[PDB]
Design a protein around this ligand. Structure first.
Ligand code: QQV
Length: 219
């Protein structure tokens, strides 16, 4: 049986909530968050990895990422594979701007060997990954004003669609007052949601397309 409740924060696998600013780098934060979880599970050490490294160095047609113009978590993972590593946020800090790539292999802090995508729209498969693998990068439809009015409980706006536009991190799941949810880490600072987190409806027919583009890296 899978556990009825999972929270990777309680296992020390989730870093502090970040603030992406005006730069559309949610995809890079999602990607590093997933890798951070893996790095902790492999090494026992929890370290913020460099979203800026992704923004600066994967901004090319090769990857189809566009720095602050947006990108894809799986292509971030591919960049890390191709590049042989990624720096920590400490040596490559977040500027919220597209800049020249200055990755340096001597500050490598994590690697990626491969990544895994889950089947489109499969909430059961996302539950399994989250319970057995770690935090999972997902795309959601976060285009509705209600997403940002949310403060507590479980977000289940009927205006939500399956057309995803933002990368976030699922760090757990459970059931709150009878409503199944996904525990989502965003990258809009602590004043977003509930200290940077939002519970989104789970098992409601792929609500906000949360199960539509799920991935996680393997160290
Ligand atoms: C975040 N702050 C800005 N949004 C993005 O970067 C999104 C995230 C991904 S997705 O997860 O929404 C997605 C969409 C479609 C198929 C698979 C995943 C897409 C990305 C985005 O807006 N773009 C559009 C411009 O080109 C780069 C990707």
């Amino acid at each position: 049986t899978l556990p009825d409740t999972v929270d990777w924060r309680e296992k020390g696998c989730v870093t502090e909530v970040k603030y992406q600013g005006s730069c559309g780098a949610c995809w890079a934060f999602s990607a590093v968050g997933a890798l951070e979880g893996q790095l902790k599970l492999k090494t026992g050490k929890l370290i913020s990895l460099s979203a800026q490294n992704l923004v600066d160095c994967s901004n090319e047609e090769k990857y189809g990422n566009k720095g602050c113009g947006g990108g894809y978590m799986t292509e971030a993972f591919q960049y890390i594979i191709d590049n042989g590593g990624i720096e920590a946020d400490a040596s490559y800090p977040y500027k919220a701007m597209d800049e020249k790539c200055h990755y340096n292999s001597k500050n490598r802090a994590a690697t990626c060997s491969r990544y895994i995508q889950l089947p489109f729209g499969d909430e059961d498969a996302l539950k399994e990954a989250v319970a057995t693998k770690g935090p999972v990068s997902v795309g959601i439809d976060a285009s509705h004003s209600s997403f940002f009015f949310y403060k507590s409980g479980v977000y289940d706006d009927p205006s939500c669609t399956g057309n995803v536009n933002h990368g976030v991190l699922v760090v757990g799941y459970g059931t709150l007052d009878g409503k199944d949810y996904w525990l989502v880490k965003n990258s809009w600072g602590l004043n977003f949601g509930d200290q940077g987190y939002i519970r989104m409806a789970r098992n409601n027919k792929n609500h906000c397309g949360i199960a539509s583009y799920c991935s996680y890296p393997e160290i």
